[PDB]
Amino acid sequence: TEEDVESQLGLPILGSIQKFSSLIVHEQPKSPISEKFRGIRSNIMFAPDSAVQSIVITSEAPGAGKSTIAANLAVAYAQAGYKTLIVDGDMRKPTQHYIFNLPNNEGLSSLLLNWSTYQDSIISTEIEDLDVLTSGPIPPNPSELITSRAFANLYDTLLMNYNFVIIDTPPVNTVTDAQLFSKFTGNVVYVVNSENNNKDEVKKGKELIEATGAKLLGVVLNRMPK
């Protein structure tokens, strides 16, 4: 199935994740699934002259499990020794505060608008070397925030303070938020729901990501069978 997707979509497979509290890499660190997350990490970082310090994670459509992939990949980076930040850049339908069991009264949107401080907006989790910047309150104008000087300045600060930054984003099919964040990271990981029978959507997502000019590092195939 992996080889089918690699050829039909024309992208390398960074890893395939079987169907499977969300944080399997933390709760079951020796599991074969957790090892596949470590394989994704390794495939991103060892692919010579790439210096990847940050990535956008997006998907072809809603319901692909993208946010769970992003969170577990962040745990894998932290376990490998990277001081890691996961940013919930989906300010429309945020989920990282649910995944990590955190409040969402302060986060990305409030930080950018000066309603909360840097120090208050980023939370250190109970997992060593893993911090989370939740989305904050839902703004009426998310794309304006992403393209603001405020975000450009924040991004520079994050690169000073973290060895690796992962930005979860909305799916790429209807809004351009993922593309706008890709200006900053220069790098995108594409989560594809293997259960999605609409291959036009899968192919279109690749096209949309490539149109940014960012490096499409490869695909994470999710919800694979045993």
Numbering used by the authors: 201 to 220, 1009 to 1035, 1037 to 1215
Question: Any passages from the paper?
Answer:
A new family of protein tyrosine-kinases harboring a P-loop type nucleotide binding-domain with a Walker A motif has been described. They have been called BY-kinases (Bacterial-tyrosine-kinases) as they are only found in bacterial genomes. BY-kinase autophosphorylation on a C-terminal tyrosine cluster, called Y-cluster is crucial in regulating polysaccharide export. In firmicutes, the situation is quite similar except that BY-kinases are split into two proteins: one corresponds to the cytoplasmic catalytic domain of proteobacterial BY-kinases (about 230 residues) and the other is a transmembrane domain homologous to the Wzz-like domain (about 230 residues) of proteobacterial BY-kinases.
In order to find out the structural basis of this discrepancy, we solved the crystal structure of the chimera CapA2B2 (last 27 C-terminal amino acids of CapA2 fused to the N-terminus of CapB2). Previous mass spectrometry analysis demonstrated indeed that each band corresponds to a different phosphorylation level, from 0 to 4 phosphorylated residues among the 4 tyrosines 221, 222, 224 and 225 of the Y-cluster. This result demonstrated that the Y-cluster of the CapA2B2 chimera from S. aureus autophosphorylated spontaneously during its production process in E. coli cells. Autophosphorylation was however less efficient than for CapA1B2 since addition of ATP was required to observe the fully phosphorylated form of CapA2B2. As previously observed in the CapA1B2/ADP-Mg complex, the phosphorylated C-terminal Y-cluster of CapB2 is disordered and analysis of the crystal contacts using PISA confirmed that the protein is a monomer. The CapA2 N-terminal part of the protein adopts the same αA-βA conformation than that of the CapA1 fragment. Interestingly, CapB2 residues 1 to 8 linking βA to helix α1 are disordered. Unlike the CapA1B2(K55M) structure that contained bound ADP-Mg while no nucleotide was added to the crystallization solution, the active site of CapA2B2 did not reveal any electron density corresponding to a nucleotide that would have co-purified from E. coli. This is in agreement with a previous study showing that CapA2B2 displays a weaker affinity for nucleotides compared to CapA1B2, with respective Kd values for Mant-ATP of 190 nM and 50 nM. In the apo structure of CapA2B2, Phe220 is slightly shifted compared to the CapA1 Phe221 residue stacked against the bound adenine in the CapA1B2/ADP-Mg complex. The reduced activation efficiency of CapA2 could be explained by the absence of the CapA1 last residue Asn222 that interacts with the N-terminus of CapB2.
